[PDB]
Ligand binder design. Sequence first.
Ligand SMILES: [Ca+2]
Ligand SMILES: [Ca+2]
Ligand SMILES: [Ca+2]
Ligand SMILES: [Ca+2]
Lengths: 143, 16
Amino acid sequence: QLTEEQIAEFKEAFSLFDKDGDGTITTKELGTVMRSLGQNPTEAELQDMINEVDADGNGTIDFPEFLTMMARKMDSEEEIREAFRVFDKDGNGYISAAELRHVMTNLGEKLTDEEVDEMIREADIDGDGQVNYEEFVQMMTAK
Amino acid sequence: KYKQSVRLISLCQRLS
Ligand SMILES: [Ca+2]
Ligand SMILES: [Ca+2]
Ligand SMILES: [Ca+2]
Ligand SMILES: [Ca+2]
């Protein structure tokens, strides 16, 4: 009994990587995402990530193999704080609308001001238009 | 989308 909300979240995650919508994630695609996020994995390191979950040996990740990676790859505290540090680029720590838009762009999402504000309304518990660390922790632990 | 986006950042972080 998977829900369609769960399935949609899996789809959305798969699509981040599968830039060409062909249903297969390649080292090229995995690398594209990682570089836009500031990382610099080598081709060989990317291939080793794939090999780990590549059940049919074809060298690329398909949907159920991806679900396998997520099961395996997804320190509660240290993991939430490291993510916060990516969002709160200037370290003040409030995540501004401009900081959120920068992360979202790197996630291949081109957003306007209005849904940036919608995004912020998921976590913002004092209505200052920003997400601070406590609000960030709440958002990650809620329903 | 916000919570889901954080998870996607964390995923790539774990991959590296
Ligand atoms: Ca692809
Ligand atoms: Ca495969
Ligand atoms: Ca900030
Ligand atoms: Ca706030």
